Structure 1
């Protein structure tokens, strides 16, 4: 009789990407964060090692965000000061990373100068001691000028520059190599493009341990399952020896969740949905929670309480369930 624990042995594992660098490593950060290294399905300790837990990065912009009034409330005291904004996310809210989303670099909007964007990055580096994840605004020509200058000045800090798509990865990849930085590979919900993108970036002689996958996740109730399946298929392939899918998975759960009506719409407007306070918190929390079971290593969040409740989830999921 007896009960035989079916343990699926993995042929390979997901890469280990080191974030940030200390004084001895030519950086100025307080500590370093390592992601990936999983040897099985997400939180399957009984059939593989999960050496490093997933981390959570909070979004910080060089300008004030256009986020709903509900989301702006917990940051009202430091929302217009990037240096003070980052310090609160780390000390008060206990973030693992600082997601420096430079929306102010947008030529149409704030139109911050190249010297201003690099000044904001350096400001955050002097504020907190955690590793940074700096991405552009979304303007190809502008980001090519911004991310290049940021990488050159913050060289040694081992930043994680963001978003290097299929048609546009040439300028960003070269910057990461010269100044020793990591890079994010973003794909429009396509594992085929995702795999092909990691090849082109690697073919430029950039190590595979310096790449992190952005599947362009969908928010809860907005095609989150399309990204959920992809993140799983990526996770399977990483264990099956596919080195091109061995990169850790990053998720922009903050942007995709708070752009939904169900996250910020008042209770008086939608009585059937309930109070918009905790409904918005859980909207970003469930989004992150579901993707954690898909293979999310770095979660880019916004709301404080949302981060706290997800951390509690991670705190319990890292408890070894090994038989």
Structure 2
């Protein structure tokens, strides 16, 4: 018999982040991951490393180690992420939290600009998670970085207008987050597109669980998103981002170095991140936000091999 090759109706749009020589393209797939005998894969998955605007306080020693000299300096930390191979740098504005430092959009915007100017790669800016706060800071952030095509992370169903508004006025792209549910990701996309932001300026965040803590739901949701794009559902034809780092390093298997029943801590902590990544790369994710440089390097070597 003959190699079975699917005739796919459509494709995931190509999203471009950054501007000028520091551009990065994602998406564009007209086939399932790596099945290029029946479709195109214009872009390989892309990876980012996280940089916090304020020093992480609850990070395991093994994760701080690769950034120990730059962890208190967002700019230096971001240059280091590029040095470690990140395609994109992801700045998490933790200090914006209203229950924490509750910093203003103006304060936060100066740091996003500082970081942005210092690196030769595109910038992804993640908020604090509190919808109300994020909607307030992103329009100020988007304004300061106007024209730099950054990726503002997280418009949700309850807060997208201010953020989509900032993307459109100031030329940025947006991440649309909905909790592991096709119809909800779809509804959000529809509402964003209703403001006339183009589908190629949107990346879907299904709000995954790491390996062992919800990864199967994440994996299936992402597969349904890719199949949706391929078969023609224009509402699912957007690239997918997975916050791998954030979730994998929360796993006990990756945080408790003292558990003899699970073997060598250093190895399992890293495999926890690399396996969540390879599994979600197999599901159809496009942008992977990682935390540990070693996980990043090994996945990239894995990608060289599978591509």
TM-score of the pair, normalised by structure 1: 0.93
Give matches, 1:1-323, under 5 Å: 3-22=1-20, 30-65=21-56, 66-91=58-83, 93-266=84-257, 269-318=258-307
Does the 8 Å contact 2:131/2:156 carry over to 1? no
Unaligned runs of 5+ in 1: 23-29, 319-323
- CA distance in 1 between partners of 2:105 and 2:158 (Å): 23
Deviations 1:10-39 (A, max 9, x none): 1111001011111xxxxxxx4210101111
Comparing 59-68 and 250-259, the one that deviates more: 59-68
Deviation, 1:64, is: 0.4
Deviations 1:69-115 (A, max 9, x none): 22111111000000000011112x11110011111111222233322
Deviation, 1:250, is: 0.2
Deviation, 1:171, is: 1.3
Q: How many residues align?
A: 306
- CA distance in 1 between partners of 2:209 and 2:94 (Å): 20
- CA distance in 1 between partners of 2:54 and 2:271 (Å): 26
Unaligned runs of 5+ in 2: none
Does the 8 Å contact 1:15/1:208 carry over to 2? yes
- CA distance in 2 between partners of 1:216 and 1:146 (Å): 21
Does the 8 Å contact 1:35/1:248 carry over to 2? yes
Deviation, 1:172, is: 0.9
Deviations 1:272-316 (A, max 9, x none): 111211211110010000000011110000001000011112212
Secondary structure of residue in 1 paired with 2:286: strand
- CA distance in 1 between partners of 2:235 and 2:106 (Å): 36
Does the 8 Å contact 1:135/1:147 carry over to 2? no
Secondary structure of residue in 2 paired with 1:161: strand
Deviations 1:205-240 (A, max 9, x none): 111111100011111001100010110011111010
TM-score of the pair, normalised by structure 2: 0.97
- CA distance in 2 between partners of 1:314 and 1:88 (Å): 22
Does the 8 Å contact 1:19/1:33 carry over to 2? yes
Does the 8 Å contact 2:108/2:141 carry over to 1? yes
